[PDB]
RNA sequence: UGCU
């Protein structure tokens with residue numbers, strides 16, 4: 022709860038890549054794509070819709086951890 | 098570049114995660130400014146300013 | 148893939164029977180073709196173990212009866228292994244406790260056998 | 270039959286997310302420990318239950334969901350004195366070949382303690398008269414991979430009398 | 436022979452600078468990739484004759 | 491019936507511990523002893539000698555002649571080391587200051 | 589290879605590696621320098637930390653602690669050269685968790 | 686040209702090309718033109734899923750000759766690659782399984 | 785370090801590899817345990 | 824620190840090219856150095872004998 | 873020039889000199905017998921601590937019969953520091 | 959040896 026509430030570009034990229042890989046590996050879609058044959062485009066649509074079932078686990082340098090949802094974080 | 102015979106390299110990632118990271122972090126629309134002083138490098142050039 | 152304790156807690160055959168029945172009903176309710184084709188040894192082992200436990204007299208058992216039998220044997224200072232063997236075998240004859248059951252010397256007393264038979268038959 | 274604690278890092282592919290995580294983990298653990306003998310533990314039958322299940326990670330590699338699950342599973346491992354009831358699935362000159370009911374054909378009773386009329390002439394002769402009982406004596410396990418079985422155990426049949434069958 | 440169909444129509448056809456022994460019936464790739472040396476590497480292998488290496 | 495053995499584990503390197511090997515450990519690691527100074531045989535095939543240099547039991551370097559230690563081609567062969575004993579010890583130039 | 593006549597590929601030099609590090613595309617850099625260039629699977633023994641073959645450690649004459657591991661072929665060659673130089677790198681593996 | 690600087694820090698990769706550049710203002714700043722010749726050589730491994738199944742079928746039917754297509758197919762069960770220049774591309778497309 | 789990470793072929797700690805991701809799967813932590821009757 | 828055994832590496836580190844166009848092959852320098860070391864060891868043994 | 877060797881030297885090269893036989897005598901015999909007696913009697917000595925067995929399978933009535941019993945020496949806590957008391 |  023102490024870190025920045027904004028979702029960084031690195032987190033955006035990693036989440037989009039992981040979701041695109043999962044979709045290319047026959048993962049279920051939660052946005053009802055309309056003729057999108059590109060897993061990266063599908064992942065971007067899911068990110069814009071705020072329906073990606075991924076939780077970022079931010080680790081502090083000391084060892085503590087904190088969970089942040091994609092729908093909970095702020096996007097740009 | 099100056100379009101006077103320069104040979105440039107073109108690479109194609111072989112992974113969806115690498116593709117997404119290249120598109121997001123190394124995006125042209127997202128890297129319109131340099132981290133040195135924040136000045137924009139992708140702007141008008143000769144034959145456009147005139 | 149390491150194990151923490153191979154002898155954590157002993158269990159009778161009724162628990163294994165209940166677990167196998169639950170797994171079998173869940174399997175016949177949510178059978179998956181590809182999951183079944185990937186590993187068929189699971190089905191075989193489950194079915195054969197269930198058939199063995201059915202051949203055994205383990206049927207007609209319940210947790211209430213198991214707890215009653217355990218509480219009845221607690222007053223006989225018998226050991227966990229002895230009571231486990233007795234619950235798994237359900238001996239109806241006296242020789243099965245006289246000779247087959249280990250640690251017979253000084254434990255039979257020629258008077259507790261009737262009580263043991265009555266408790267295992269009730 | 271005895272419970273054994275285990276901690277396994279189960280990998281579930283991405284196309285199994287629609288299913289319940291606990292059910293998928295149970296199915297995977299069963300498929301992985303179905304008819305396999307763990308060294309110094311015994312032959313595992315199936316999964317009993319799952320106690321602890323921590324967060325589910327996703328590596329930057331395969332991309333699947335790796336979960337470290339702590340569970341308890343049932344294994345067939347006597348306590349060196351357990352009594353069992355099996356069937357004679359053959360017999361050899363050096364010793365009978367008894368096998369528990371459809372469970373495992375690995376019990377090899379040595380014929381060196383019965384009354385002094387013990388011998389097998391290869392005609393499936395069990396023993397000369399004056400549901401077969403078995404008393405486990407010791408366990409033993411061995412490895413398989415040694416270049417670029419594993420459970421037999423010792424069986425005993427003392428002078429139990431056996432008023433029902435000699 | 437082909438590992439899939441068992442045919443013996445294995446032809447070595449280089450597809451865009453990629454040596455590949457592929458079957459001509461089903462197109463099953465039998466073997467692909469060849470290890471050559473590289474020029475600096477070639478430069479550094481020294482020439483030694485059989486008169487000395489053989490003995 | 492069947493023993494339980496893990497097929498593959500997602501092993502990640504934690505750290506590299508540098509060190510040295512004694513002559514006994516070198517002998518234990520090596521597979522054969524190279525004692526012949528020649529490379530190829532006298533025959534016109536020019537095959538590599540046995541227990542000598544360029545022996546195929548210490549890996550392979552040709553696409554046609556596979557490794558003798560492991561029955562695999564060059565693309566799958568990782569290679570094996572060999573030990574050569576010296577009559578008189580010698581100072582290690584790398585560890586001479588040490 | 590290096591040259592085009594010998595069908596050579598492009599080189600992601602030290603400057604390209606520095607640019608990728610500055611961008612922070614860790615997965616891209618990995619896929620470039622490890623997966624698509626010199627990807628290979630070796631066998632390392634968890635007891636002595638040496639390199640095995642076909643899931644077998646000739647040093648300890650056992651195969652229980654041997655496990656597969658992804659590693660660049662250039663890094664494997666470096667490890668072999670160091671072992672030849674008597675600088676033995678002892679790899680202590682562990683679970684990815 | 687050493688192992689640390691010549692083979693570890695900077696090393697050569699595949700699926701890459703080198704070509705001369707030319708001006709073209711009709712394209713966006715975030716877009717780059719690639720010739721058909723280099724595009725037919727540089728391939729991308731796409732996994733068959735429930736979304737682009739028909740697109741991959743059409744690409745396989747086109748084949749390596751027509752620009753929109755593929756060159757190789759690796760099955761899910763077996764890792765034996767299949768060259769599209771040989772064999773029935775229609776059958777290969779009709780027998781495309783997920784994964 | 786980033787240099788040894790690149791040499792060994794593992795994702796460097798800097799960049800996108802500083803944190804870890806978790807899957808928002810439908811689950812139930814600490815599921816109900818089957819009661820032991822004999823013990 | 825004092826070495827009595829030399830570790831000859833595998834052939835993957837010592838690439839050998841079979842030049843059929845002549846009566847010779849292209850070998851690296853490590854192979855020649857090891858051959859010279861073995862020859863010197865044999866010569867020392869001969870002199871000791 | 874030195875000749876080339878096809879096979880490697882023997883792992884155990886033969887030697888023309890053999891070890892001198894052991895000294896014989898009642899003294900040496902008695903010393904051997906005493907060393908053997910010491911080997912046999914020092915393992916059962918309380919000072920010879922054995923690996924504590926663990927992971928017992930079950931408890932039985934024959935536990936009291938098979939219970940290993942051996943007297944334990946009492947160290948001198950006056951001479952030994954306090955950091956060694958149980 | 960040329961190229962940027």
Ligand SMILES: Nc1nc2c(ncn2[C@@H]2O[C@H](COP(=O)(O)OP(=O)(O)OP(=O)(O)O)[C@@H](O)[C@H]2O)c(=O)[nH]1
Pocket residue numbers: 959
């Ligand atoms: N075409 C061409 N010719 C070369 C090349 N390198 C060397 N030469 C010839 O060799 C002379 C100078 O090369 P050097 O740089 O001395 O060769 P070098 O010093 O070994 O260069 P390195 O191989 O990089 O060390 C030139 O004057 C040329 O005669 C080259 O790379 N390409």
Ligand SMILES: [Mg+2]
Pocket residue numbers: 098099100101102103962
């Ligand atoms: Mg220019």
Ligand SMILES: [Zn+2]
Pocket residue numbers: 437438439440441442458459460461462463
């Ligand atoms: Zn074929």
Ligand SMILES: [Zn+2]
Pocket residue numbers: 547548549550557558559560567568569570
């Ligand atoms: Zn080899």
Ligand SMILES: [Zn+2]
Pocket residue numbers: 633634635636637638645647648649
């Ligand atoms: Zn080892």
